[PDB]
A paper describes a structure:
DCC belongs to the immunoglobulin superfamily, and the extracellular fragment is composed of four immunoglobulin-like (Ig-like) domains followed by six fibronectin type III (FN) domains. Located between the functional DCCFN4 and DCCFN5 domains is an 8–28 amino acid linker, which is contingent on the particular DCC isoform.
Here we have undertaken a structural and functional analysis of the DCC construct DCCFN456, with a 22-residue long “artificial” linker composed of Ser-Gly-Gly (SGG) repeats (herein referred to as SGG-22) between the FN4 and FN5 domains. Since there is a 22-residue linker between the FN4 and FN5 domains, which is disordered in the crystal structure and can potentially stretch somewhere around 80 Å, we cannot authenticate which FN4 domain is linked to which FN5 domain to form one molecule. In the concave-shaped CFG β sheet, a group of hydrophobic residues M921, W931, Y895 and the aliphatic portion of side chains from R884 and R865 emanated from different strands stack on top of one another, forming a “hydrophobic ladder”. A stable, solid FN5 domain has therefore evolved to serve a key role in netrin-1 binding, able to resist the force generated by the binding from the either side. In the crystal lattice of the structure we determined, four FN4 domains are positioned around one rod-like FN5-FN6 entity.
Author numbering:
A (entry chain A): 723 to 816
B (entry chain D): 838 to 860, 872 to 1043
C (entry chain B): 837 to 865, 870 to 1042
D (entry chain C): 723 to 817
């Protein structure tokens, strides 16, 4: 019936070329969540965008450049619109 | 009378220059900053064939003239001698120290400044101190040495949402001037940075 | 076959110090890379270097010759693998006050006009910079200190000076020192010159 | 009959343009003196040369330049030859 909240927790575990995300749904269960929209890039979360299922808690980002400063966003969305995002900085291991 | 000849001005220290000419007769010696607005002189009297003009600004070019006087009869001024005094360590600090985030690449800032007013010589190098900690003394900060011909510098791989401290000083052929006052720059967090 | 550091910069500090500073495009973020920095007089016979090791992105080359041009090169080494030397950066150190004294000070009577001599000398070996002026002291007295001699100021580009109206058959003392943009060198050793008497000269 | 000696004493009293000389015959009276030969110049006593009577003790040099270093020679002579000279430095009085 309205836009969802921000996710409760977000963790990142950067690799040499991968970056692993682990999160948990919004603290308010009343609002419907259709899925999550992930964004990532270098110095900007607008570069790349994927949208995943509402039941996913883990995502593996692939084909990233080694030794770089990435910015990752995560938002939940439903039929109303998009919710306030959570941001996390992650650095790839050279 | 005949004005003195062979007038030569040689810089001693950074504030002293010794004029010397060749010929009881009294000599009057005048000097003046060759590059200034005031067309007014400073002068002194002696009976030697030399005199040391003191209390001068360092790294500055002066012009000197001598006349001779005896029994109410003064000569005309001699040929001018040019002398540049020695250099000295800077007295002021670099001015208008500025830190701005580089667009559109966060975690990195561009530090910009302007040369000190009292350089007292040619600035050989700039020394830029910056740190993340509030307590460690100046000698344990991160040090970057920039050439005197540059007034900007790029610092990379900083941390996000963290208060940084900045100190900068000017060097010179005979030493290094005093540090500036600390500049506080807060890198932004991703929440604020994107809208 | 590693990548050599780039953006190598060498800036002269004092008259004996130069600060090299480079950047590496391979530094990540467990292992630390050692930088080797070499320097050498660019205009000399010895094609041999001096070097030092550090883990910082800067190093201060000290104990250098003043008013001299040096060339600097940096390499990086890590786990038995060395890179090539980076492009050389050139830096010339600043001037300093002379340490030696002017050599071969000479006094000869000018012909055929006595009572006047032409004083000739040679620039110091350790000038450590461009000589701005020579200061020539001479006196008739055996006892008065240097600050009460007759002082003559000659330009740094001239190696001769003329002194006139001397006395006949009298021992003169001569002292010379070199000044410079950064200070004044030590006085030379006394030169003894005896003007001739009219009896012997004719 | 033989070469004469050098003069006993020589004195000079420089003026603004003149120079006055005063001397006395050799201390040895045995040797005959026919006269004296005076020489003067700047830095050299060969520039100008005058010869005077044996009985003269004073001579005035004229038309010299003010503030200059003159050199004066004096020798006694006879028919045998010229004797060893006396030399004296004299400086003109500036105006």
């Amino acid at each position: 019936s309205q836009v969802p909240d921000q996710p409760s927790s977000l963790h990142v575990r950067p690799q040499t070329n991968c970056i692993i995300m682990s999160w948990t749904p919004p603290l308010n269960p009343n609002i419907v969540v259709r899925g999550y929209i992930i964004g990532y890039g270098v110095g900007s979360p607008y570069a790349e965008t994927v949208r995943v299922d509402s039941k996913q808690r883990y995502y593996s980002i692939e084909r990233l450049e080694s030794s770089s400063h990435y910015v990752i966003s995560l938002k939940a969305f439903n039929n109303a619109g998009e919710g306030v995002p959570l941001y996390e900085s992650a650095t790839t291991r050279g | 009378m005949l004005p003195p000849v062979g007038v030569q001005a040689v810089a001693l220290t950074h504030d002293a220059v010794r004029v010397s000419w060749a010929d009881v007769r009294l000599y009057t010696v005048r000097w003046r900053t060759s590059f200034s607005a005031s067309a007014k002189y400073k002068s002194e009297d002696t009976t030697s064939l030399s005199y040391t003009a003191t209390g001068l600004k360092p790294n500055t070019m002066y012009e000197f003239s001598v006349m001779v006087t005896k029994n109410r009869r003064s000569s005309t001024w001699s040929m001018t001698a040019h002398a540049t005094t020695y250099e000295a360590a800077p007295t002021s600090a670099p001015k208008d120290l500025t830190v701005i985030t580089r667009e559109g690449k966060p975690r990195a800032v561009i530090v910009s400044w302007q040369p000190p007013l009292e350089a007292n010589g040619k600035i050989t190098a700039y020394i830029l101190f910056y740190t993340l900690d509030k307590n460690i003394p100046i000698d344990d900060w991160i040090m970057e040495t920039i050439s005197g011909d540059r007034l900007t510098h790029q610092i990379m791989d900083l941390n996000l949402d963290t208060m940084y401290y900045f100190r900068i000083q000017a060097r010179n052929s005979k030493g290094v001037g005093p540090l500036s006052d600390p500049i506080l720059f807060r890198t932004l967090k991703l929440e604020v940075l994107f809208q």
